[PDB]
Nucleic acid binder design. Sequence first.
RNA 1: UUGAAAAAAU
RNA 2: ACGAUCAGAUACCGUCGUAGUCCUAACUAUAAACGAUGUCAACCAAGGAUUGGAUGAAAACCUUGUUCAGAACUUAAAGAGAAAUCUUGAGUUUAUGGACUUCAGGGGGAGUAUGGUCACAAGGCUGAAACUUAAAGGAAU
Lengths: 81, 129, 205, 95, 31, 76, 215, 52
Amino acid sequence: KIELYIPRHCSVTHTLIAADDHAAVQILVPHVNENGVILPESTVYTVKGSVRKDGISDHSLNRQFQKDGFLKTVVPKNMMI
Amino acid sequence: VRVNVLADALKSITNAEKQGKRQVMIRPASKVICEFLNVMMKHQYITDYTVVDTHRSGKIVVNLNGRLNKCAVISPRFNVTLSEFDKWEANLLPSRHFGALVLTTSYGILDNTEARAKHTGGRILGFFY
Amino acid sequence: TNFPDILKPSAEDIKMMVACRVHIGATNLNFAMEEYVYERGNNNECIFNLMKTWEKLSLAARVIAGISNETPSDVVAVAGREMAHRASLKFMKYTGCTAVAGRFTPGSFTNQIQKKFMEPRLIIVSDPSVDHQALRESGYINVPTIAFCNSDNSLKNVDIAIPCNNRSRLSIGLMWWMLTREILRYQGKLARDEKWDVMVDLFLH
Amino acid sequence: TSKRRNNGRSKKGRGHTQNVRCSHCGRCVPKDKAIKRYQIKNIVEAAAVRDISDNSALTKYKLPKTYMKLEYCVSCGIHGRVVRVRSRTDRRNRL
Amino acid sequence: PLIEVDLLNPTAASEAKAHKMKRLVPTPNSY
Amino acid sequence: GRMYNPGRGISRRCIPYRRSEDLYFLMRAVSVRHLEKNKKDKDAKYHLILIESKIHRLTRYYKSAKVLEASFKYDA
Amino acid sequence: WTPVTKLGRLVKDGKVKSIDQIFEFGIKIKEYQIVDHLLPGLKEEVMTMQSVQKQTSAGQRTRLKAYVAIGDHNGHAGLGVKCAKEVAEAIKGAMIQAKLAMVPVRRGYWGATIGEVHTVPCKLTGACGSVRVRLVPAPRGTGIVAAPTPKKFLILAGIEDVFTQTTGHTKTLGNFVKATYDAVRQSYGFQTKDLWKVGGVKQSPMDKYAKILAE
Amino acid sequence: IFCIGFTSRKSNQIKKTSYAKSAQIKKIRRNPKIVACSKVFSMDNVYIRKVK
RNA sequence: UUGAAAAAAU
RNA sequence: ACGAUCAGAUACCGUCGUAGUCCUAACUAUAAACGAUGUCAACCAAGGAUUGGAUGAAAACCUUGUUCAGAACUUAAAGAGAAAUCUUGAGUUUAUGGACUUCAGGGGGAGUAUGGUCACAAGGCUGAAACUUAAAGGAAU
């Protein structure tokens, strides 16, 4: 095949992840049931290296977590875009 | 002073995308800047935009989605004949399959692939990867 | 859905956090921590939102629980400040997560030739200001980090930040106590409808 | 090249400043570039204040102190051990 | 700033703080 | 910024979102030309040149706009 | 043999098959024996053997610095540097660093998608120090139009057609190869139009087999 | 008759330097109680240093 | 308080 | 001009002292005249403090919040660069084009010769060539 692989896409910046990027992470948030016990199913978030080193990863993720429903009111309404 | 409003807007959009910002703001909005965005919107490089009227050539808010690499203006708009296209494409665009030029022709503000189809030349406005 | 109804903070948990003045923070406010701050106190100090503290607390515990539910040793809990040494040590006891007690020897995540070289997949730090070294080494091993950040600390190389007081003896012990209990609840090894046997005083320094 | 960001002076938004005189040499040095030191000393040293108070013609005289402000050129400052050649990183320290 | 906020719909308080010409639609502070 | 000095003042009147001589005042030039007694005032002898260069720009424009008569010329 | 890393453990028992499986998830290669397992038959090239010196009280302490470029011609390459007191040790030391510094090379077509890949996909520029190297895609027939120093490296990376334009002090070879390797190294970070698609949900090998390596 | 004075600090004052404006200074121009100018600035060290 | 100088190529 | 020191001292060191140092009038037009950083405009991370207004509270001066303009400072894992370092740019540049003006082309010869012009003068401005030579130089170890 022409491509060597399909590179990951950062969930925060919607930009590619380098093969030499050793600051990028991968946060897995398992789904929880009505009882409140984790499940083998999970959703994967990827954050680029340069995002972390600025102080933005924590706030950027809260935008994604709140959108996906893992948080309820952490991020105010006027800060969601 | 502000010689070129288009240059100021494109350089503002490029800076925001490098920082990974979700949206940008352009203070003086013209018809040429609005029409330049439609070429970028038709290629899905930017989500959309909102021309807010302020009675003073109102501002613009542009939504970006992690796709634009660089959009740049070109200083004085050179008259580009149809035979001078691939000379300009071979300079300003990274590859034959990726980039996109913008020309202000008599048939509106078109890109290179549809000004060639429309069979017209014109002054060159800028480009965007 | 994603945040079911079994996850509100029960009145017991809120009662102790105000008692341990968890919501009470420092004076200088980092820009990245403005969202968690609700209002400024009477002598110009930040007051964290208790709900925002809990929502981030559970979310951090959920991430730890998933990673630590099959490989407990793949979680590392570092704690530099002498105050948080006991609480970090009990967190290790009840979950199996490795916990570096005192000084963090630089290169313990990068130098493979080291005898004490550990390669985790998640790192929990007690204080980003004191444990900046551990956070910086993560940026070399692609390992996400979780911090008990305060209103003045720098949020560089932290992904999940829990806004809580990380200087007082009570709050340091209490928050680690809640994190351990929440992790066990997600694991299913501790029912949500019962009371945890171990009291907070065990975690206290 | 540039050993200092402020070029050793303390002048930012002006063009000229009056000269002063080095206290040990008399060299003309600019006011902002001068090494400024303030000295408060008793007129009577500790080795003699006992004798002065002993046979004193007054009841509750409080001995005075001098107040002189000294300015040195850089060459006289270093040689006089007022200031030292600090480390390359210690140069930035301003306390 | 680094913590990005919405631009199209500014908060009610935020437009009160900013300079009169720097609001989304410049309005005077007089009557 | 300003026309001559490097100042950058942005104070402006703010017309709301609802729609429901200067050349004469610049002749200031007379007042400074005070200069007859303070002959050594090299400052006011410079700020007068700045004022007079402004007048030669407003005259140059009011003639193009066909406002002033074509024979106009400022002089003492 | 007997690796000391989590990823290195997976490779030895044949759990990670392809090298690119490592490259997708950014897992750092910390043992050179891993590359020799998933990349057999790596061709060898030695670029230069330059001697540095250090003035001492007694005399000059000379050490020999060796640049070696490694990589198979199927889109993988790496460059390593090592200085030591002996020539044999310098090449062996640089051998290891070259393998640890492996980087995938993205290549595409010039104008038509007629197999197989020959040239770089877009315009790339690598910035070492004063030396800057720019790679331009070229048609099928054109070889590697470049200086003898990066042409040796570009052969190993498996790029047959390319147009190069160089700027800076190219007479220093250390920066010339590093600037070439720096150009290729970022070939996969340039998000073109065809890479817009998010892609399916995958799993890191260090997470798929996390329970297995625990014992 | 020569008089001297100095602008003083304040109990709650935080900034180190307490200078008066040029416009403010011209307003201030056996016991010296001159001080109550306390409606113009804060003054503490008021003396008569010479009489000729 | 005084302390000047050290041929060319290796 | 003397007296010291010295091999010598026409110098630093000490003493005396003409022009000069001050003002007025007319010239001169150069400085390491420096931020060695042209003018104008757009964007641009975090923080404390300060000069002058405006605006709320706190009973002109002080304490606090917003905002405008000015001289500055601190941090960067980021951007640039050869590096020192720069960040209110020296960033947004082989992914090269915002507008305009001036200047430079290895080191000497040389800001020299000649021509022109300005000045009472010293001098300033414009300003080469023959010839000579593999280096001259910048930042850091």
